[PDB]
Symmetry: C3
Subunit: 87 residues, 3 copies
């Protein structure tokens, strides 16, 4: 089981991505309880990065399944497939 962690803002908000059993899932903290996030994609390995434009977070998650990495994008309205390609 393998994780990636990101955080932003002053609360802060935290997101922890966990790869387990070929599934990546997401747990979320926004200042009170931890909860399960919307992100669900295939993979055995995960990394992530984020940035703020004002108060709005943008997240990129790099989900690797076997020999292929897929980027997933959060830009305020759902998870969308990004343009990233690997070697």
């Amino acid at each position: 089981m393998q994780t990636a962690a990101i955080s932003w803002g002053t609360t802060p908000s935290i997101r922890v991505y966990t790869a387990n059993g070929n599934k990546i899932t997401e747990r979320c903290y926004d200042g009170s309880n931890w909860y399960t996030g919307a992100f669900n994609q295939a993979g055995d390995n995960v990394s992530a990065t984020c940035w703020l434009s004002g108060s709005a977070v943008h997240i990129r998650v790099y989900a690797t399944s076997g020999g292929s990495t897929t980027e997933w994008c959060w830009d305020g309205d759902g998870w969308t497939r990004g343009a990233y390609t690997g070697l």
Copy 2:
């Protein structure tokens, strides 16, 4: 052997967490030599994130041992167990 890296401030300070042999340890840079940090917890996988409140760093380390992830918190006065729960 698997690592996680965080950094903050303008020096910068860097912390590198290494999982090896079911032990996670910490090496630290604050502008001169690298040294061994106080963090020691069980795990075969590690991620980390941090933020600043003014000059004061807050660190969260996610230590995974088998099928369970535990959060460890640095908030200026020692490492304490966090509220994070996984699936």
Copy 3:
């Protein structure tokens, strides 16, 4: 195959490091297409962190090959070996 991801600035710029087959490589985004970066070093595991001094990025990549981690530094003019030592 295992990745690390960093990002900076407002574009943003993103760097994704991938360890595969004992080689770590780098893919780069600066606002248009993804491209292959200059970084190439040995390892089966990678983490990374970065910071800005004004507009200038500084990157540290921690490349682990077997039982040894080596730090690699980007400070505006090529990749150089850092002072990091592990246990």
